Design a protein around this ligand. Structure first.
Ligand SMILES: CCCCCCCCCCCCO[C@@H]1O[C@H](CO)[C@@H](O[C@H]2O[C@H](CO)[C@@H](O)[C@H](O)[C@H]2O)[C@H](O)[C@H]1O
Ligand SMILES: CCCCCCCCCCCCO[C@@H]1O[C@H](CO)[C@@H](O[C@H]2O[C@H](CO)[C@@H](O)[C@H](O)[C@H]2O)[C@H](O)[C@H]1O
Ligand SMILES: CCCCCCCCOCCOCCOCCOCCO
Ligand SMILES: CCCCCCCCOCCOCCOCCOCCO
Ligand SMILES: CCCCCCCCOCCOCCOCCOCCO
Ligand SMILES: CCCCCCCCOCCOCCOCCOCCO
Ligand SMILES: CCCCCCCCOCCOCCOCCOCCO
Ligand SMILES: CCCCCCCCOCCOCCOCCOCCO
Ligand SMILES: CCCCCCCCOCCOCCOCCOCCO
Ligand SMILES: CCCCCCCCOCCOCCOCCOCCO
Ligand SMILES: CCCCCCCCOCCOCCOCCOCCO
Ligand SMILES: CCCCCCCCOCCOCCOCCOCCO
Ligand SMILES: CCCCCCCCOCCOCCOCCOCCO
Ligand SMILES: CCCCCCCCOCCOCCOCCOCCO
Ligand SMILES: CCCCCCCCOCCOCCOCCOCCO
Ligand SMILES: CCCCCCCCOCCOCCOCCOCCO
Ligand SMILES: CCCCCCCCOCCOCCOCCOCCO
Lengths: 344, 199, 344, 344, 204, 199
């Protein structure tokens, strides 16, 4: 909500409270999952040419004890400048540009968007990303937007590959970069492409047992239709040494694919059908070709107004129970979710 | 018109009209109207209605109109998960095209695809049974919500719905009693109500 | 404080900063206890019939180092709808309904409300509760308020009884339900009753030393007087397998009792006298009947206005120092607390 | 930003988001260091004489994963009343008064103020500080500002030296007090003195290897010039058993000194030159007189407006690579820092 | 008015009036008014006054009136915890009904139940002493916080308060010295001020 | 006006004016103006200019003016770190007094201390060349920013800058050509710009 706007300064306090419950045979997923998001968005106009901005957004889980630990974490935090027709530049913890197209399939009522993780080579939110963005291609090609982005090493907690903000192999990275291009064709149809390229840490290539390679790249194409209360969207990605094979490491090759279809009823209900799929190739302990993710997803959300909505979402999980699911820790079971959402 | 079993029916109807209705059921409905408060009447009516709304959906799909199919999906969902298992009509409060309406079930789809009614039975203690609607509607007890009812529960639902229906009709009693032939009128109302829901 | 009200949506940012210090011979209680609370309460008007809401409130302990751990936690977070006066419904982390009467004695300047805990079945704030509430009983009896509530299992971290939001017993629970009823009688006087009933987890009935039983029940009645600057209140609850015996487990049976008297002076001081007491019966291992809580509490708070207040509160603690207090981790020592409070 | 001011109550939601990256040969410092601050400052006018107030401020690290721990902490939280001509009084977690003169040298774009730590007696922010302050010496001597302050024990996590808010030797303290005096001599010139005295805990005198003494005192004098867009400031302090010898304990004796020079340009750039230095004397275990800190600092920051700023900062680190620098974990490498900062 | 020791009393008063007051004390009170800054005077006056507010409550309870009983509780609590051990009159600026007022102590309650003064001793260097009020008020040195003072501390408080009271009277001393029978006024002013305190209460 | 090599110069200038300019260079600048979009020209122009701002800075310090020295510090600092390695002129948008100005560098520094030009050569493909400015300017390729270039990069940079300025003069082409004696105009213009930067 715009809570400040005096003399070219604007402040936006936003968030959502989502009372949410999971039913599942998997005792890791089943139960209460109530959580909360809070954030601030800030704008300051410096000149007519130049305007500066920042955003922070916090996720805090309301589904445990008051004596419980690590229930909060920072999802976004960045500042930047916006130069009008020369673009914008930002730095902080922010979304990868890969997500400039793959976001088009991240529209499900509560699941989806899990062919990738957070802190995973710029497929979604990441530490240490500088991002140049430009809309309408330098004011030339109306409706064509491109983005360029670089990210420095986030290494081990200690050792020769260490940095200040070290972590484990699953979310480490060397220096890397990515870029994205998206075009709005004939009002409602949209095409996009995204590329990413990052070095991998010595621990990446020594500790997890699965995944070997000096670099980690992703190729993505996606289309989407958004008109006449119809929403269709699809996205295809190839990744090398980038998609995680659960706890066992990374897939040397993986092809990820998503399809979504939605209708928006005048009375306020929006149903959703989707199919999602991640298949890993050349894994290193005999796993060979293995599936990492695969499910149909059916669900719906009822919108009371722009501020309150409720939803149900049903993940029909098509993974069989391999020695590879049961060693990577990949959930094999279906899941149903109900949520009621206040947002401000 | 129809009534091959007009003789059979008229005897079951006169047994229903002047033996079970004056001596039971309607007395049971006067106790209802004087002793159970209006909120509990609205809550029971919605709670039972709600168990049929998933089948109304599955049948609006079969009759070609998936829009009203999701009107009754939305009715079931807001009302089951937020209106306390159907007790509160939240959907009705949320929007006019989610108001509660009379069920369109498997008899309707059968009637909408042009299948004819049975003869016309009139049953003791029951009331009116066509092979297509009553009983054809039983096909909706093969898929969930109504396949979850044990046979005891189905009659409980049957009963409270009935006593409420009788309880509401308590104030227009008459003209079925001040009418030359209350079997032909009661039967005429039957087919007009049932042809309208098969549309 | 109301910081937004545009287009029928209201947002309230509220909280308090409490500079607070404990004096006690008990070194777990003694010292600085400064903390702060911040939260949001939100409303959106949907129709004339229907109106939606949510609220979150956070507890941040400001009394340790900046290198310290687990100083913050969510006490409330839930969303809901309110149906005019067919009632209201909400889900999230919220107060148990037992607290609808038990709150009447939780009014001391700084102590009290510790015959029970948080995450203690439905007695205080809890994870995963759906709560229906109804005022003036369906338009049938003006001033009689009713409530019903359910909570799903919140189980162990691992094993057959596990859920996503695992914890240890004393804050686990099986599926459960509770109900509350309160009546505003004549003028200031009010009666209330509450019942709670929850399955108990296998871990509760296996790992601690005290308390065995398939269920955990609570029966509570209380009265209160609130008129002519007098506040008197008392509450009696009986417990089965539900109130914690400190660290040792649960008391199979326990009777808890609280009585408080307060006057509010025109010039701004509110003194408070109270007595509180929890006695646990048929405990195991030889303990038999032991006292869990027992103290007189004297204190007072001065209100400068709606926004600043001060208090002293003296817990005159009558617990003996048993073989049982020292093994359950029960504080036997007195404590005095001084606090200065800014609220917004 | 002032987001509420109705009914004699003012509410200020303020903070900064700082996208920030470190380049250094030292992998404890090198990498992303993006973070954010959020806080509340509230004022309530009680009478014509009386005004109550509170402030809380939170530090949130945005530079690690969402799986990471202890990324947020409270730096400030206190409430108080301000009497005007009689001064002000408050309690909470707040800055030690030694910092009322030491603050004059804490103005670099990113470094400085690290001859000491936080939770380091009363030299920076600490738990449990009551501080009386008086401006213009009780309204008598115009421009002379003084402060008096006391702090209760913040002891062990367990043992005879324990308190509720336990911690480790490096951030413990006994009862202590401090005082500050500052005088505005001419106009732009200012002199200041601060005194501190604290009991040190039994653990401070037993578990760390360096530093023994019953008490922990600090003497400080400082000067500053601030006019005509020039800022010159300097500070010299000696410590007994108060300055930390990195991880190895405390310096029995230590002399700290800081010098900074800044000009504020017509066009918005403020360059900064500084030198800082901390020397430990009579250290034990053969460590004679050792240097604790030693570097020149060159830097500059550009202000776009009251809300946006950017900076570079170059710490030219002159520490030799001793046995003492390394065993305390004292970084010997230089550091370069770039930051882009949005504030609200 | 009784006065069995009137002969004794006028002898001590003339000692107090024309030797102790001109030769000492009034020099001590002008040095006070000329050398101690007004804030340190307000801080000392507030600080000593505060030592008596627990006793003022304990006796307002004993007199049937618990409302002003906690008025002086509120004064003690706000001023000790927020006014720096009593130095700052926090309660006083916080609300008009918590302003400082002159104490009602055990003499007051003895008098409010009608006990009776006794004679009227006049002491050299002390001034006016009744066995009921002075001396009866001494019972409030049996319970805290006034029982916490060493006897040195009790002498300091009387001294600092005495010099301050004289320092404030410095501007009306000159108008008692000429007025017929200055013993009678001081004796009436005593019994007028002291009878007002038994039910009734105003001050500064 | 000085010019000891006027004879040599006028013949090299006619080589530059009527064979090097019409047959190459100006065709390359007409191609530049019609095939490279304006944003890439703005970025190339900004990028190379940016490498000269550390030297302008060090030379304003040498000329006694430490204020404008840091005007060019911040221009380099905002534009390298926020304007994408020099592509975008952030400092220029941030404040009128950090807008681009023509480089000063070491020739400027000599002229500000009263040194005075060489003669005045005109070179066969280069153009106007003085020993103090075009020659002294080489002193700033001794310390970083400009010491980091291959000698290929310095040749690249000269080329891109020359083609851009050539492209801009394209619409004022026709008015040095409608003039008697164009060597004198080209020479006075040289000495007016170059004495202006030295002051
Ligand atoms: C709202 C109005 C205010 C109410 C006023 C206060 C009510 C007063 C309640 C007094 C009750 C105390 O009653 C008495 O408590 C003591 C102290 O625990 C118990 O005594 C117990 O503890 C003591 C010491 O702690 C042990 O040495 C002793 O062996 C044990 O029995 C007595 O068995 C009980 O009889
Ligand atoms: C308890 O009740 C207590 O006793 C009596 C009630 O008769 C009141 O008695 C009161 O009477 C007078 C009215 O003339 C008040 O101005 C005064 O403060 C007090 O003496 C107390 O203020 C009240 O606090
Ligand atoms: C405004 C802040 C921009 C910070 C982004 C800088 C990222 C650069 O990282 C460089 C890492 O250095 C590589 C090590 O050398 C090999
Ligand atoms: C199906 C909707 C899209 C086609 C887009 C393909 C992009 O991926 C490139 C794969 O090549 C990498 C090997
Ligand atoms: C679009 C409607 C989705 C409703 C899904 C209901 C899921 C219930 O399945 C549980 C087994
Ligand atoms: C006008 C009716 C024509 C549409 C009929 C569609 C029926 O198909 C239903 C099957 O879907 C399930
Ligand atoms: C009033 C009945 C007309 C509704 C017919 C809708 C036609 C079917 O829509 C196709 C959508 O299917 C998905
Ligand atoms: C507003 C009346 C016009 C009818 C709108 C078109 C209805 C078709 O939408 C139904 C398609 O969604 C059904 C699929 O559910 C899964
Ligand atoms: C305090 C107001 C109401 C108190 C009523 C107590 C309820 C009586 O039931 C006693 C038995 O409760 C179940 C016992 O648990 C199983 C046996 O142990
Ligand atoms: C207008 C006269 C009202 C006086 C109120 C009656 C006194 C009530 O006393 C209650 C004492 O409460 C105890 C607080 O501890
Ligand atoms: C109105 C209650 C105030 C009493 C304060 C308690 C002080 C007790 O100190 C004991 C040590
Ligand atoms: C509004 C409350 C302000 C609280 C003041 C803090 C007092 C801290 O000092 C306590 C030190 O311990 C007392 C003596 O130790 C023995
Ligand atoms: C980094 C220190 C810069 C200060 C040097 C003094 C500058 C001289 O002031 C110039 C006049 O401005 C007024
Ligand atoms: C006015 C302050 C300007 C300070 C800018 C400092 C830039 C220093 O960069 C040093 C780079 O050294 C790293 C090379 O190490 C290899
Ligand atoms: C003159 C203003 C209003 C008079 C009401 C006085 C009522 C006082 O009752 C107070 C009860 O005493 C509190 C007990 O403290 C312990
Ligand atoms: C790294 C050291 C930097 C220290 C430089 C201090 C320079 C002080 O100079 C003050 C200059 O002020 C001049 C007035 O502002 C000029 C406005 O008009 C500019 C005309 O071009
Ligand atoms: C605007 C003036 C200064 C701006 C440019 C500063 C550039 C500083 O970057 C220096 C990077 O070099 C540091 C090396 O990084 C670590 C490599 O060694 C680790 C192995």
């Amino acid at each position: 909500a715009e809570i400040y706007n005096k003399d070219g300064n604007k402040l936006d306090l936003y968030g959502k409270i989502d009372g949410l419950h999971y039913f599942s045979d998997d005792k890791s997923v089943d139960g209460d999952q109530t959580y909360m998001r809070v954030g601030v968005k800030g704008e300051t106009q410096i000149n007519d040419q130049l305007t500066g901005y920042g955003q922070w957004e916090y996720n805090v889980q309301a589904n445990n004890t008051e004596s419980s630990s690590d229930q909060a974490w920072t999802r976004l935090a960045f500042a930047g400048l916006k130069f009008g027709d020369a673009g914008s530049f930002d730095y902080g913890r922010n979304y990868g540009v890969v997500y400039d197209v793959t976001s088009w399939t991240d529209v499900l009522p509560e699941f989806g968007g899990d062919t990738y993780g957070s802190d995973n080579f710029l497929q979604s939110r990441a530490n240490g990303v500088a991002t140049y963005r430009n809309s309408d291609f330098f004011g030339l090609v109306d409706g064509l937007n491109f983005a360029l982005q670089y990210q420095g090493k986030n290494g081990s907690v200690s050792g020769e590959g260490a940095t200040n903000n070290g972590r484990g192999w699953s979310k480490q990275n060397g220096d890397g970069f990515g870029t994205s291009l998206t075009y709005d064709i004939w009002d409602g149809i949209s095409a996009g492409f995204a590329y990413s390229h990052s070095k991998r840490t010595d621990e990446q290539n020594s500790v997890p047992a699965l995944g070997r390679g000096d670099n980690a790249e992703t190729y993505t194409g996606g289309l989407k239709y958004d008109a006449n209360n119809i929403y269709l969207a699809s996205r295809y990605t190839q990744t090398y040494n980038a998609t995680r094979a659960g706890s066992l490491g990374f897939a040397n090759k993986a092809q990820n694919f998503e399809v979504v279809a939605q209708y928006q009823f005048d009375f306020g209900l929006r149903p959703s059908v989707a199919y999602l799929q991640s298949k890993g190739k050349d894994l290193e302990r005999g796993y060979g070709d293995q599936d990492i993710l695969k499910y149909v997803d059916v669900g719906a959300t009822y919108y009371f107004n722009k501020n309150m909505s409720t939803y149900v979402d049903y993940k029909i999980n098509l993974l069989d129970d391999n020695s590879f699911t049961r060693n990577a820790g990949i959930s094999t079971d279906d899941v149903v979710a109900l949520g009621l959402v206040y947002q401000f | 018109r129809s009534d091959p079993l007009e003789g059979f029916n008229r005897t079951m109807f006169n047994f229903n009209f002047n033996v079970v209705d004056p001596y039971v059921l309607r007395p049971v409905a006067v106790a209802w109207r004087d002793y159970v408060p209006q909120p509990a009447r609205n809550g029971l009516s919605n709670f039972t209605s709600n168990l049929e709304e998933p089948a109304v959906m599955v049948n609006y799909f079969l009759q070609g109109d998936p829009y009203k199919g999701m009107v009754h999906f939305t009715r079931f969902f807001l009302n089951t998960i937020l209106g306390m298992g159907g007790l509160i009509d939240v959907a009705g409060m949320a929007n006019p095209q989610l108001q509660r309406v009379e069920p369109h079930r498997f008899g309707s789809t059968l009637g909408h695809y042009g299948v004819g009614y049975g003869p016309y039975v009139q049953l003791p203690f029951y009331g009116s049974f066509t092979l297509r609607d009553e009983g054809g509607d039983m096909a909706d007890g093969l898929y969930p919500v109504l396949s979850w009812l044990t046979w005891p529960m189905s009659i409980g639902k049957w009963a409270v719905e009935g006593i409420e229906t009788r309880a509401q009709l308590l104030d227009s009693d008459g003209l079925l009693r001040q009418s030359s032939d209350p079997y032909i009128l009661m039967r005429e109302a039957y087919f007009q109500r049932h042809d309208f829901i098969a549309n």
